[PDB]
Design a protein around this ligand. Structure first.
Ligand SMILES: O=C(NCc1ccc2c(c1)OCO2)c1c(Cl)cccc1Cl
Ligand SMILES: O=C(NCc1ccc2c(c1)OCO2)c1c(Cl)cccc1Cl
Ligand SMILES: O=C(NCc1ccc2c(c1)OCO2)c1c(Cl)cccc1Cl
Ligand code: NA
Ligand code: NA
Ligand code: NA
Ligand code: NA
Lengths: 494, 494, 494, 494
């Protein structure tokens, strides 16, 4: 049940947001952001660089000074401000969902019902944590009173991706602001607009100036400037595994800022022979093709027990052949365009590679429209662990189906990856679900479902899929600096 | 492996323990403790009364005075003392095991491998908690520093049953001592001996005098004096639901002391048609017959799905007839005698009451030896929910087997009870297991097992099976008094 | 900026509230509620009794059924509902504040700025807890997966007092509803009206029918009915220690329902000779006289070190004489009337008692007006520990000032009470502060302040001031029932 | 009351420890470890490099395989093993104490009463955590059951320093083993002996082969090997801020392993004018001179209020001159030799800068014995913030005394450092205490004490003193990898 979208939403924010004001870049340069459905430019956006990041960091540092409005504010009041922000986002939900669809390509129905819903749920979840993340009083030996203070880490540099622009902004801001930090945020060049607008709403909500600063721009410039900045206390980066390597080195090279990363994956989706066939087929489709395949936790390795392989495959092809690709503003559209021409071309490449390395093309495999970055839903069968398409993140509507015989075999094959973001298991058997959930080396294990996120439950990678967790109580850990205070007392008693 | 037992072990402690010293009752009166296996007196025990509880409580109060050795001792040291006590108990394991069997009647092999293992594991678990039950520092509104101290509740009265004499002592002392409380404990007249020997070890381990005081005696006398005492801060009572209510009333009429209760049960053991038959049969036998059926969480309503009912009943009667009843010191014996004559008569009465209401007596039904309180492993088939034996706690080797058709049915029938201590579900199905464990109104739900206890996991009743939880972190809650300290500061900052 | 009050607000709700609907008593009976300022009837209210409670409990039980809208609702959505209730209460703040003052007698400026603000803060605080009170996964011995579910305790009977009608309602509803329980609430006959109007807002907020039910009526009838009810799972009572006793006995005689109590106190306010004199004198006046002295935690024993005694007393008496008594709607008013004629008389009796037993009456001591129930702020000096006014809760504007010499002395005297709700220490010295805060046997110790409450920090009694805690994370404990699920697994690994 | 030392303890272990066996370096190269009191070689030690590290990592990885004895072991049993290891270390206490003094130089009385006591206390503390670090059950949105498993991070590389050889080993092993990780440990070339002996005790204790592996060697070889190893999951480094940056860059350039750092400091010790003079002077002495000044948290900037400055300086100089230097095994010795030639020369270098830059050398200043790396207790007065000795970590017995006026001024000065490991405040004033503890940007703030460690309380740096915390519950975090398991259920209910 969804409000009709404005199919050409106006843009009101496209600059640098520092101290609750809008700036051009110091260089006065701009860059274009494109509508992926048409390939035409939406507008130019302020192209931030090191000098701009420098202004934002100083503004945040100022806001963080002992005795500032933000530092003195009651924790409960930080929660009031987060709740007010969620309220304003709801007020503007229909507009934001459309703007999201315009800049990103995802279907408006999904932006509205999924993304913006999750944004509201995330911010309202963290609003509640603001005054509940207690330190401890500690029964240390001797005549001492010892306790810990949970203080903010300080100035947090936050780098976010283009696949879920508003949701990722929320995943970062929620825990950060709940714990009284200040942020310098770099948004993706492919999708800067919606986070920029939310910045205006952060102003409207009443956050003191400098508490949230947003610098659009490129990675080799704006992003690198953040990771390497000498007065940034903490960096949180979501993006490719390859770039997460650059970030941590830059943190080592600079001021030894604390680092968390959310990176790529090649998550195994395991279908046992006792699985509910219909449910598992639809879920495996969802697991892979959701959001044009542009999900770090995409179920891009579908392991199917040989007894049910043939039928599972037949039903999966039928579903993929009937997945509607088209204008993201049409309510019937299941899959919009890929985010840009670079991804468009990289995905086509992987398709070309999968055919060459002997995988069996079951459907799709081509461009799905002559304008915009639309790709046919694609399904490869008889995929082998050694193939490129079975090892590398494609980040597109390309499905991999593999065949296995035993539960021991599959555990080994599933875990034989340098990735470890997520995994799933479909089975009716209690013992099989418990065996696999324990044995799978992944940050999240779904059982008879996929892509089930809740602001209550932590998310993050094992292995090279990242480190640290977002969401849940766990999402607060990376944003807290712990101070022990130990006080001599006349005579300690229990 | 089990050392050969001393079948008539010497008794060294048979009086009232106060201030690490042994006292006669102030009346000098004593009572007999009997060997359940023969019906003969083992020895006399000091019969503690109100005047003896008063002495015990005054001693405990003095030990709890601010600045006392017990109050000043580091938390980690209370932990060291508990580990030392466990070490001492293990040193005297073979002796304690045999004395447990002599006074209580359970098989020596079980006293040694189960009861004593569990006593050691309980004490060592709680030793670990001594210095880890943190208070909080709290982001309170305004210019204040606010925190909580987790202090001991104070003088705790503890009344334990006769079914697991040593283990029940450990479940009480573990948490209370870990958190720095002092104890006045009343032990069952049926089984005073092992608990009094452990008082010797407590002194030997170095607990300051008055920290643990033990008063053997009767219920309406010593036990009542504890529950009704004006200077006792907290009572923990394990026993029947009936006496559980005397305790809460006595607390309310006196000083409004804090109360926790571990009462009776009539726990449902649910076997679905897709259970592993062999496993389900043995586990169901175990679930009911363990400890001569003297378990508050005995699976005394065995619900079996109609499709497998017949096979289940045949296998269950075969197993009940094979159960060896004899001298608990004989290694072949699976079942010792009931704890005393009162229990002996009562259980026999219940069997009669069941042969009345048209339940099929399938085996046993009668006395099993002309010497001692031995009762034949009894099975009732085709039991109906309205029958007295399907409603009331028997506390003897009497198994009730009921039939059911659907999952909705068994849920309602299982839940239709004023008891809710435990429950079990046997099934291979993920969803059935999850549906039932959520739906069942019980303090503990075991899946594909029964009587699985861990010091790590809490245990306690829903409904009239008690309130509060023992074991786990949760067992600390009832023994902690929370103090908020809120301090005016010059200027609060995050 | 306090909006001008309507001195005669309209009454919209005066019936029994069940299933989100307004009912007359089955008996059709009503009782008058009085304006303690004029002594004249405001209106009549439905007089609920056993049969009305029974209907409410049934409605509550029905709303609690597995699969019901309240049981199935996302934890996070319970939070949304609590947040909406707060918004509506804030929308109607001016009205509720005026209504509170009409029925209770407290100054309108205080109803508006203190009570209402605290209600909003309590509700918004607990809103945040709804989806954050996690159960545990537990490293139990053996090949098992063991975890705890934190389930709602169930049908909760809440009996609340007249001193803080709206605030006490919120302190009870917040934790109960955050944790998914259902409520049958008995409001005070002196002050039923504001609670009933809030019921209307509960409906407007969208809480399912039967989740909150309110039965206005008397104590020995509606109150006792809830306490003794066989289908009420938990009872929370705030009132006199004497009635707390009846509540506990009732719980024990019936179904062993869980019980928490917030009872009376005789809280010591300790002023060291090195305290800021001006601040100490204002805070001491506030501590005793706030809300016409009708606070469970009133600083009703003011201990003042002998070096500063004569000056403190002189300043205290001066402050008491200038305290403005009169019309609670008049901004100039500091002190309204006591709540009713029963309290009025009780306070006059204690005043006479004080004079009779030799306490030095320094000011007031009598009736301050003819209409209503106004009492002169009264100060006794040279009070001794053995005096009745030094021991018993007066619950009126009657201050006790006692002289002490040493910090070791004052600890014993402060602690020599059957009460232990709160205490305070005024001193500039770090060591004196830490010494006293540790040594004082009280649920809350304020340092250099008094009556500092935060939804974040727990509050409750030691000894006979009650058991359990309200506010903070601690306030969730009594509203939770712990279920252990222990599942057999093929092979346990770390 | 310290048992007599063996002043020339025999060495039993001097090789590489892998799989509970002793190995020569693959290259058979060795290196001398020297007694710093005499400058004479104690013995040769296996010089491990990359190849030996690879052997140790493979051993660790194997011990960590699902289904291995270490993986299947009950968590409570891991605790039993830690406690057993502690008992063994206690058995060998005088021996390890003497060998520590022999290889490191610290006085045997301190090694015995401080280092080994703290090793015992740390290991016993973490033993208790083994089975108590619960994951969560989470009330996620929707029809799901969601929980977290707290799993081990896996193969942990641990690089420890030479200043507290045994204690640092325990600080790393306690948490890592309590949570069921496996370790590859690199010990400092200056002090490899006591840690290798503890490896024998780990074997004796019962730890499976490969769970703990120790590779002595140099930093740029063995250490860099661990940090860059593609199969090490986590690294914990304690050492110079300079090296810590190498560690974080290796992490980033290899496998993105998780990293924690405990680095250097320049901690401020703040003496307010109302401090207790005698106490403050003796504690300022201890704060800096402890462990030959070889403490990361040394109070190396002693800020003293101008009103008591002169008296404080005179008293400090007097105490410094009386500080006994010499043979660490002599009971009168307060200060042993520095650890090695490199440190010796670097300290003398800093003393030279201090003189060159115009700091008043008040006592000491050079070599204190003709044999061994003994340096005189040195005090510089009237130090200025800009001086090299006020800024850089000296890590020797060189005291900086600075003069200040206001509390605001000194906060700004103390916080003007890229270090933030610890700090201390001396004052009798409640408000001053609270103001400073909050305001100081340090990982630990001591009040009226210094160098007060407890296993219960976390320790770690702000800014460039490190990241992550050791000790306490917090110390378990870096050693846990969190897994979310989200399960579809028939129907979610509260
Ligand atoms: O729509 C859902 N997930 C889609 C999804 C996929 C990848 C994502 C995501 C949501 O959030 C960030 O990454 C979804 C579902 Cl089917 C069930 C429960 C909760 C949720 Cl949120
Ligand atoms: O106005 C306050 N207390 C008044 C008060 C007294 C007794 C009470 C109460 C509020 O709530 C229940 O009992 C108050 C103050 Cl002065 C400082 C901080 C927070 C608060 Cl809430
Ligand atoms: O002797 C102590 N500290 C000395 C010390 C200094 C630096 C350290 C350390 C111990 O452990 C690691 O770093 C000490 C003191 Cl005076 C009081 C309580 C507890 C402790 Cl352990
Ligand atoms: Na775009
Ligand atoms: Na007996
Ligand atoms: Na009234
Ligand atoms: Na050496």
């Amino acid at each position: 049940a969804v409000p009709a979208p404005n199919q050409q939403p106006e843009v009101f924010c496209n600059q640098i947001f520092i101290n609750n004001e809008w700036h051009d870049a110091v260089s006065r340069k701009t860059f274009p952001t494109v509508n992926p459905s048409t390939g035409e430019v939406i507008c130019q956006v302020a192209e931030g660089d090191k000098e701009d990041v420098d202004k934002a960091v100083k503004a945040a540092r100022a806001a963080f000074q002992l005795g500032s409005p933000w530092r003195r504010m009651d924790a409960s009041h930080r929660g009031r401000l987060l709740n007010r922000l969620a309220d304003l986002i709801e007020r503007d939900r229909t507009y934001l969902a459309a703007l999201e669809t315009l800049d990103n390509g995802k279907p408006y129905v999904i932006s509205y019902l999924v993304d913006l819903d999750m944004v509201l749920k995330c911010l309202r979840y963290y609003a509640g944590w603001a005054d509940k993340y207690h330190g401890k009083t500690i029964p240390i030996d001797g005549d001492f009173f010892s306790y810990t203070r949970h203080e903010p880490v300080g100035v947090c540099g936050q780098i976010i991706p283009w696949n879920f622009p508003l949701l990722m902004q929320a995943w970062k801001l929620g825990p950060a602001l709940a714990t009284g930090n200040v942020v310098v945020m770099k948004v993706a060049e492919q999708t800067p607009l919606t986070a920029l607008y939310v910045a205006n709403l952060i102003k409207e909500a009443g956050f003191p100036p400098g508490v949230v600063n947003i610098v659009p721009g490129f990675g080799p410039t704006a992003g690198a400037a953040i990771a390497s900045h000498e007065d940034v206390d903490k960096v949180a980066f979501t993006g490719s595994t390859e770039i997460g390597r650059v970030i941590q080195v830059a943190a080592g090279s600079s001021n030894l800022k604390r680092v968390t990363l959310e990176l790529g994956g090649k998550s195994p989706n395991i279908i046992m022979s006792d699985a509910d066939m219909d449910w598992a087929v639809e879920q495996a489709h969802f697991a892979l093709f959701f959001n044009q395949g542009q999900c770090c936790c995409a179920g891009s390795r579908t392991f199917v027990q040989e007894d049910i392989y043939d039928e599972f495959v037949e039903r999966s092809v039928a579903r993929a052949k009937s997945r509607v690709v088209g204008n993201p503003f049409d309510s019937k559209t299941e899959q919009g365009p890929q985010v840009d021409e670079t991804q468009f071309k990289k995905i086509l490449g992987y398709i070309n590679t999968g055919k060459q390395e002997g995988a069996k093309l079951l459907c799709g495999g081509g461009i799905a429209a002559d304008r915009g970055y639309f790709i046919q839903p694609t399904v490869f069968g008889d995929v082998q662990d050694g193939m490129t398409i079975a090892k590398e993140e494609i980040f597109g509507p390309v499905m991999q189906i593999l065949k296995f015989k035993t539960i021991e075999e599959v555990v080994g094959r599933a875990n034989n990856s340098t990735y470890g973001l997520a995994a799933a298991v479909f089975t009716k058997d209690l013992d099989k679900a418990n065996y696999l959930s324990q044995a799978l080396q992944a940050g999240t294990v779904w059982v008879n479902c996929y892509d089930v996120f809740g602001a209550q439950s932590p998310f993050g990678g094992y292995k090279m899929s990242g480190s640290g967790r977002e969401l849940g109580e766990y999402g607060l850990q990376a944003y807290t600096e712990v101070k022990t205070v130990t006080v001599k007392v006349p005579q300690k008693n229990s």
